Write a protein that binds this ligand. Sequence first.
Ligand SMILES: Nc1ncnc2c1ncn2[C@@H]1O[C@H](COP(=O)(O)OP(=O)(O)OP(=O)(O)O)[C@@H](O)[C@H]1O
Ligand SMILES: Nc1ncnc2c1ncn2[C@@H]1O[C@H](COP(=O)(O)OP(=O)(O)OP(=O)(O)O)[C@@H](O)[C@H]1O
Ligand SMILES: Nc1ncnc2c1ncn2[C@@H]1O[C@H](COP(=O)(O)OP(=O)(O)OP(=O)(O)O)[C@@H](O)[C@H]1O
Ligand SMILES: [Mg+2]
Ligand SMILES: [Mg+2]
Ligand SMILES: [Mg+2]
Lengths: 267, 118, 494, 437
Amino acid sequence: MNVTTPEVAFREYQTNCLASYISADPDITPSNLILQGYSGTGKTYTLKKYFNANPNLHAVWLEPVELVSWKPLLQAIARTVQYKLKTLYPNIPTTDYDPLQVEEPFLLVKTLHNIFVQYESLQEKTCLFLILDGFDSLQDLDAALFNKYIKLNELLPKDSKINIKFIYTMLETSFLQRYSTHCIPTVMFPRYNVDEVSTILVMSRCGELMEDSCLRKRIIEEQITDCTDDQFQNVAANFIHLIVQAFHSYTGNDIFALNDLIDFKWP
Amino acid sequence: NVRMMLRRSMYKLYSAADAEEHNDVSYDLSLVENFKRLFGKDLAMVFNFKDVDSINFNTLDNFIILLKSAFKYDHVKISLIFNINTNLSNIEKNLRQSTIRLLKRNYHKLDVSSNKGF
Amino acid sequence: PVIRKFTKKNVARAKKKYTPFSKRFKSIAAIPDLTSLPEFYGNSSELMASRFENKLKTTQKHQIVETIFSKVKKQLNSSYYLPARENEFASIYLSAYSAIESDSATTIYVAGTPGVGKTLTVREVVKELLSSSAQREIPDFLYVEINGLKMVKPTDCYETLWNKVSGERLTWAASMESLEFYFKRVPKNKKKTIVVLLDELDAMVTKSQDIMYNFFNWTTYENAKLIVIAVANTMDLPERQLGNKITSRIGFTRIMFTGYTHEELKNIIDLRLKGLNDSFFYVDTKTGNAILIDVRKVRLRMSADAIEIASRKVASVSGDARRALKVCKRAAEIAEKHYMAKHGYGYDGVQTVHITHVMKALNETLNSHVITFMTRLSFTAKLFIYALLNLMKKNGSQEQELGDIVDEIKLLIEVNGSNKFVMEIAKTLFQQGSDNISEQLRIISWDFVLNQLLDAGILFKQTMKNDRICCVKLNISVEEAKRAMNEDETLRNL
Amino acid sequence: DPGFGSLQRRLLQQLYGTLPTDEKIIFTYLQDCQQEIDRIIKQSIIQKESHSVILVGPRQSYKTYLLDYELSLLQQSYKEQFITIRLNGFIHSEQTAINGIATQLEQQLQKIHTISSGSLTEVFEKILLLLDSITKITVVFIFDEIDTFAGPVRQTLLYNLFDMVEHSRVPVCIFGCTTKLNILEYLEKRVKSRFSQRVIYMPQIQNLDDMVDAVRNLLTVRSEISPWVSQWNETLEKELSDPRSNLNRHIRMNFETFRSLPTLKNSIIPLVATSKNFGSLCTAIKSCSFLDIYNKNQLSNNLTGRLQSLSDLELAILISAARVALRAKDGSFNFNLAYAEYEKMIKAINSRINTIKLWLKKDVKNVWENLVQLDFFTEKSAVGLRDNATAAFYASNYQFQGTMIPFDLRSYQMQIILQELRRIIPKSNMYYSWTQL
Ligand SMILES: Nc1ncnc2c1ncn2[C@@H]1O[C@H](COP(=O)(O)OP(=O)(O)OP(=O)(O)O)[C@@H](O)[C@H]1O
Ligand SMILES: Nc1ncnc2c1ncn2[C@@H]1O[C@H](COP(=O)(O)OP(=O)(O)OP(=O)(O)O)[C@@H](O)[C@H]1O
Ligand SMILES: Nc1ncnc2c1ncn2[C@@H]1O[C@H](COP(=O)(O)OP(=O)(O)OP(=O)(O)O)[C@@H](O)[C@H]1O
Ligand SMILES: [Mg+2]
Ligand SMILES: [Mg+2]
Ligand SMILES: [Mg+2]
């Protein structure tokens, strides 16, 4: 299938991996897959970048970073599935079930089965994608969780005109090695290096801090009519070069703390 | 723990903002970001940790990390107040600096006592 | 306006009453006769029993295939006369007949190991008691089946007792009170004798035996007539759960059933087979269907010496007729499938089974596949268990950490820098031969095999976070570990 | 050509095992079990046997997949005879399992021609009466991870199912997939008495040629579609025959490291997945140099690369901790002890003689948590992640001494040891002279 590749600067390996993994037709996509990484690598940013590259495919988004346990995920999923279904199929009739009615994965699958049987009159089969950002970052997590979510596609009947898929993102990899016997496809993003993070920053924060107020503030506090966008960018670039040359030993290959410190000390 | 006081805050907010205008929704951080499409009005929260010093600091850190996850809706504001009793430098390093970095952004300081300036 | 702090909507409330029977007549003279009542004494459960018969009926037939052994399997099945265990019949039936003649409240308790035919014998005894009820000379009484394992909550015994003796629905706390009322406050002239069988009490009353305490309180009346029996495995239960005073004051009778003897086992199993024993069958030429007294007329038989040996081996351990019968059935199955494979009919003049195959079916139960599997693993698990045994020989500790066992592993590998097997499995295990791969402190697949052995049960891991100081134990033995070690040609020499 | 793309999809779905029920491939090294189990199932489907059986084998070994394959073989000629039941211990429980059973039984009985209503015990007795009490429709259960139903005390459902197998007239087929080997050990007297006790195991790979012919079969075409079908077949044959090929070496690697096929399936999928044109396909499967990148980036960030990417301050403080741990009894260390040893190291370095700068306590404060969050240190009497719900619940109720006492005086623990680091690091560093106690 024709898939527009996102011409990224540093994550083209994972771009190739995922563009080969996933396409419109569910037949050439794996039953379950993981996208693990580390903070600051922009794994989530690149996921939506690839979605921009491929508009026709769609997915739901959940952020259990705020949710605390399993049942809140159950209610959120039960809400979002039917919300997306009815929003993207306006003409289809429905008997909207209560998302709060879910209190257990058994009830969740029961209501999804009801949704599918009421959606039985589709013209072609369609598989959607689910996203759980920070599934290991939960606050009451235990070791008996991931396998159950892996087991969603099995209890579902095979005659479903509408199916689903799972996405994940971990940080530590300790719990990931705790469960790797099931041979799940996985794509990884190694922590960046000096030049990689430097380029990432000078192409990400460059505009953000170039259209900031303080530049124009100082340009007329000094009252000097000798300037150009090229020289603004050059001075910002060399100041960031100094910042990284000073505090790389402090942090290394991270972006969040550097951005916070820049916001604090730029003025 | 974290979830208990989260439920306290959600129950407070719901039972306070319901009767003022006249179905049930669970107690979670989804409710605050779903306030618009339930009541029609935006919301601004003010928080008051009564005894800031005698609480479990890892639980506090988990709670603040959880609350910093609702700044992506562009329709809500909030504010936190610590009613300190000892000092700022006494406890600003007792808690991990991960929380303290952003807390250096916009703060305010008051000299507080019953005998202010005689 | 109000908000419910927590909701319960999936609840399934049961439509049952709270008012006991004691509050719908309001006077002793205002009570009718329950015998002259259509709803009482279970005259309505028949419609429910017969209402669900047609839910699973169909009429699909296509090229039915029938064979020789299956009829014998059915003849040998447990779903059906016995003279082996008859003295207990003559005793307990005599006691029950005398008890019903006396119209008293007698108590009796029995036990036995699973497979002693206790349930079979009691069911046959009560069936012959049903026949004596068909004599129409003894006072009629109604049976009650009590299967707490098929029941969920132990207190539901009262609920079902009321719902089957009256058809009325209530909760335990009211049903048992109304039953107290129905028992001690009700005279004899119209109340009916009831016989009850309790089953496997060891798990009904795990908490405090309040339910059975209430039962044994019911079984101590002179104005109420009941026949109470129970089944268990242990024997000390009446004095253990209750104590000595209650069990002595009740003064019941005690008995237990023991495993049968080999001769009785063989006699009974052949008794379930005399109809087909040494029978002659007309057999077709294509399907091989065996029809009894293009067609043969052949004979059927089975190894009586195999009966002897099969009964002998298993009569000395437990006496489980279920075990004996399944052994016979599986011997028949293996013989039948081997015979079928001889010709290869497909799917759409002497026949006999041998001592060899009967013992083949009987012995694979005790032959454990664990030995073969653990000898058929990869080299890594065997090497690691051997290292564990080396540490056991070195310290006599009965326990070993993870860091210490890994140290022993590295020492055992590096000491043998000469052996050819370890030489040839050397470089393909850390960085996998080629460059561009940095070394790793641990080998590949160690966590894989560790979780494999954890999931196998031979390895025990305590709850700890440190990957080094976490204690580790082996579960089976050191001798069997050697019986796996030395069958590797390379391990024996090192 | 798009025909080659359709061929790519065809071989990808052959790799998965999602074909019609005539081309789904099974190999001679398991035809024994395949022809055993198809018979074992049809004997209950059409011959009305009530056999009870429990499969046994490790994860990723194609047990439930083979059950599904046999049932899909059966369906084409048997669209009415059987009813399918799929269950799982983790997804279900001792209470919701019966509700799922009732829902399934009611919602597929309509597919050919109430139950779900009532309370817990009420539905229990409904199902009990319906199953306990011309021709009968066969029922097949597919248990998954019966280890959950292998609890210590009650587990009454398994006893009820086996008693139903023995007593009922309907053919009650039971299949059990797990990972434990000795299952019968869990059981009590009753479960052993009721159960047939006949448990089947799975075969293992006994020779390299077995996996070679498995690869051949899984990479052989059985239909003429694309102009390169014969080319693919002959290339696979000729390349796989040669024992010198990198792919045969990786066959050996599977044989000796893991001894399980699905991980190899995962490893091979990306090759064709990223394959674009015929020339790149041929060269990449010839040199197999992209397997180098695959296995380089597969386990890249486990133990080594993470330590390869870090600041020299991290190395210095780690050395300070490691030396004092070796000096110590239990190897315990703290923040300021490591700081003291670090300053001693820098003092010696500047005494032996572009300059060197030491970083204050405030500077070490930020990076200490970066160390502890990268799985290099721990707490002395630590317990990391509880397995189950009750333990996770009590974790949040009772707090820790390490929680309440300040940052820099809680007892820590080490992951790597001095000599391990000494032999691991590049020895050319200026800090190499300071990696030996
Ligand atoms: N290749 C890239 N191109 C552009 N921006 C990038 C790239 N890699 C990383 N980034 C930046 O990295 C930032 C990382 O923030 P993000 O919210 O995506 O967190 P993360 O790495 O997914 O971590 P976590 O899931 O733990 O929050 C992204 O906002 C993006 O701006
Ligand atoms: N004398 C006998 N005659 C015929 N069959 C017998 C005899 N003794 C034992 N059996 C067989 O042995 C089986 C053992 O069943 P039994 O009545 O002992 O079960 P149980 O002890 O109630 O079972 P559980 O402990 O599982 O609840 C009987 O069903 C019957 O098939
Ligand atoms: N519908 C399917 N189509 C293709 N392949 C499948 C399908 N279902 C399962 N598989 C294959 O089954 C293989 C694993 O088999 P299976 O899940 O039965 O293993 P197992 O060891 O019995 O697991 P468990 O005990 O967890 O059920 C996986 O490699 C997957 O490719
Ligand atoms: Mg992120
Ligand atoms: Mg019994
Ligand atoms: Mg399985």
